Amino acid sequence: SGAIYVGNYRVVNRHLATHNDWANLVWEDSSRDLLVSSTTAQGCDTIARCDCQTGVYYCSSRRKHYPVSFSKPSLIFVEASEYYPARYQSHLMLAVGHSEPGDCGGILRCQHGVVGIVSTGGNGLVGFADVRDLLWLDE
Numbered sequence: 001s002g003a004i005y006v007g008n009y010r011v012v013n014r015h016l017a018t019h020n021d022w023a024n025l026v027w028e029d030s031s032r033d034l035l036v037s038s039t040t041a042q043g044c045d046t047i048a049r050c051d052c053q054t055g056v057y058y059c060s061s062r063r064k065h066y067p068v069s070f071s072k073p074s075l076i077f078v079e080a081s082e083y084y085p086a087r088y089q090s091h092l093m094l095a096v097g098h099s100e101p102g103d104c105g106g107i108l109r110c111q112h113g114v115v116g117i118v119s120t121g122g123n124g125l126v127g128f129a130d131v132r133d134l135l136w137l138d139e
């Protein structure tokens with residue numbers, strides 16, 4: 001579990017979104033596994049605007065942060081689940097890093113701010129849904 005709070009927005013994995021997220025929907029994209037809902041309280045997370053390929057992510061299954069090198073956002077094949085059929089997930093970045101089911105939602109950050117959230121992995125890999133291209137999160 002986990003979310004990004006920036007301005008009047010909450011960014012979560014689309015497969016983990018709640019009834020409240022869907023009743024206050026701003027934008028969602030099944031191909032990115034993202035959903036953004038509106039909030040009453042003001043969020044203070046800073047979104048990174050960069051092409052960093054190094055950062056640190058929070059891994060709940062180890063209660064630890066890990067430094068990682070990660071790939072550029074791209075279309076990557078993802079296995080079927082109770083939430084999606086087998087498909088290409090867009091704007092996904094992979095790193096060699098552990099992860100298990102509930103790790104979805106952990107933040108990846110670089111020196112500039114929030115880069116994205118854990119959305120994939122499996123077999124010793126973890127993937128991140130990138131949010132750096134969503135320029136409207138700041139306004």
Ligand SMILES: COc1ccc(C(F)(F)F)cc1N(C)C(=O)N1CCC[C@H](C(N)=O)C1
Nearest residue numbers: 015033078081099100101103119120121122
């Ligand atoms: C880092 O995520 C994982 C962690 C562990 C596992 C494992 F292999 F153990 F079952 C799997 C994953 N994945 C990849 C995963 O949870 N899903 C399931 C829900 C939908 C997510 C999506 N973006 O489509 C993909």
Ligand SMILES: [Zn+2]
Nearest residue numbers: 050052110112
């Ligand atoms: Zn950066």
